């Protein structure tokens, strides 16, 4: 819900910064000269930046050993063995790199095996100035590393083809993470249109980071490995530790919990990590069922929950939801729905970016200017 509160960065600003330096007159020469025999060289550029240069494919030295001896002398002549094959496999990589840069206009994501092989990728991870815990994290999740990587095409100055591979740096590892799932909470009273709703906007991924909490409003930006959550700090907000207090106590004085108010009492379901939240309102048929034995629970009007233990599917109206079968322990924390504490006669029914105290302030302002005006006319 709160994705609009995020800032706006430039994902490839670091990569393009290296490309812009490589465009200089003598910068291309320094790269080519250092990689004379060695395939890995840390070239220090004219501006002062230290970059690890890699020579992945040598087509020039391969052509120089199959063009110069061949061409000679009067006319081209025949080739022996499986040596020619070596050219088909080497050229294929270049063709695939070209196809990728052509369709993606010089910037590709994820980074393919043709752009950087597993052997070349694992070599860079080992040569990176990072901790042993980070190295093992990247080595075991190469596909995620590739997904969070960028490849920017810089120069085609002759006799060399250069492109910058922007690799992720995981500065935060093994810190506790938690996902917050929220669904609308409405009153159940029978007359249609007389009902008031409340929804916690603060849903998404939350991770403990340097005395603070990194909040990811768009849970789609994060990737779950069944235990490890792969996120990008670019799509996050830095919130104080007190944000977690909202789960145990929404009316806490330490942190002002974010809410959304409406009158739209529409039925829906939020599929959680270990179950399903069911928001049943109106004439909707909300049900929980086991595939082997059919319907096992029929939900009444309001907001309820079912664990993934014994429940395979959840049906809300004409929508069938398959529940996540991840093994874990669920707990139903019983408590009076807050929406019952608010008077519908004096309630802010159209708030998109509000909080638990902002609503109280809006009610206090309404309640006072209702009673004071009532006592004013009472003296007639």
């Amino acid at each position: 819900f709160l994705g609009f509160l995020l800032g706006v960065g430039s994902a490839i600003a670091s990569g393009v910064a290296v490309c812009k330096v490589l465009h200089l007159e003598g910068e291309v020469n320094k790269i080519k000269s250092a990689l004379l025999s060695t395939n890995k060289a840390v070239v220090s550029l004219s501006n002062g930046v230290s970059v690890l240069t890699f020579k992945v494919l040598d087509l020039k030295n391969y052509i120089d050993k199959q063009l110069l001896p061949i061409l000679n002398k009067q006319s081209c002549s025949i080739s022996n063995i499986e040596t020619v094959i070596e050219f088909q496999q080497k050229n294929n990589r270049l063709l695939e790199i070209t196809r990728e840069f052509s369709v993606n206009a010089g910037v590709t994501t994820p980074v393919s095996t043709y752009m950087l092989t597993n052997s070349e990728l694992l070599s860079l991870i080992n040569d990176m100035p990072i901790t042993n815990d980070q190295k093992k994290l990247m080595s075991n999740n190469v596909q995620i590393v590739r997904q969070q990587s960028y490849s920017i095409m810089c120069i085609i100055k002759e006799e060399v083809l250069a492109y910058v591979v922007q690799l992720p740096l995981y500065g935060v590892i093994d810190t506790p993470c938690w996902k917050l799932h929220t669904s609308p909470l409405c009153t159940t009273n029978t007359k249609e249109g007389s009902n008031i709703c409340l929804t916690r906007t603060d849903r998404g991924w939350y991770c403990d980071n340097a005395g603070s909490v990194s909040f990811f409003p768009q849970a789609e930006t994060c990737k779950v490995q069944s235990n490890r959550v792969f996120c990008d700090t670019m799509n996050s907000l830095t919130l104080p530790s007190e944000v977690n207090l909202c789960n145990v106590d929404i009316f806490n004085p330490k942190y002002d919990c974010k809410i959304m108010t409406s009158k739209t009492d529409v039925s829906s379901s939020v599929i959680t990590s270990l179950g399903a939240i069911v928001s049943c309102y109106g004439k909707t048929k909300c049900t929980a069922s086991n595939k082997n034995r059919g319907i096992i629970k029929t939900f009444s009007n309001g907001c309820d929950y079912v664990s993934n233990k014994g429940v395979d599917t959840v049906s809300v109206g004409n929508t069938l939801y398959y529940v996540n079968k991840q093994e874990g322990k669920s707990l139903y924390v019983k408590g009076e729905p807050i929406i019952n504490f608010y008077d519908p006669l004096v309630f802010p029914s159209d708030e998109f970016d509000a909080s638990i105290s902002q609503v109280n302030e809006k009610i206090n302002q309404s309640l006072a200017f209702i009673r004071k005006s009532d006592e004013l006319l009472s003296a007639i």
């Binding site: 992945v56 050229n91 270049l94 950087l116 085609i156 910058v164 929220t182 980071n209 235990n227 009076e336």
Partner: protein, 73 residues
């Protein structure tokens, strides 16, 4: 792994705990180079085999360089 969950009836919300972080905080840039060869348009009248497969791959090589050059700067 020990993934746990808590549902709150009072607020219509659920918290899934027991997860571990792996947040991308920064970047690691590295220049990846491929050494290319500029070749003259010379020809041969051969051949029974092999060189005809090598010329097709050499024409595909030129086409790849052309597309990369077309990408401008």
């Amino acid at each position: 792994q020990n993934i746990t969950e808590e549902f709150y009836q009072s607020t219509c919300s659920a918290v899934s705990k027991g997860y571990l972080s792996a947040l991308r905080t920064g970047w690691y840039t590295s220049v990846i180079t491929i050494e290319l060869s500029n070749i003259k348009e010379n020809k041969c009248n051969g051949t029974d085999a092999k060189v005809k497969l090598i010329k097709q791959e050499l024409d595909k090589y030129k086409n790849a360089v052309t597309e990369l050059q077309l990408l401008m700067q």
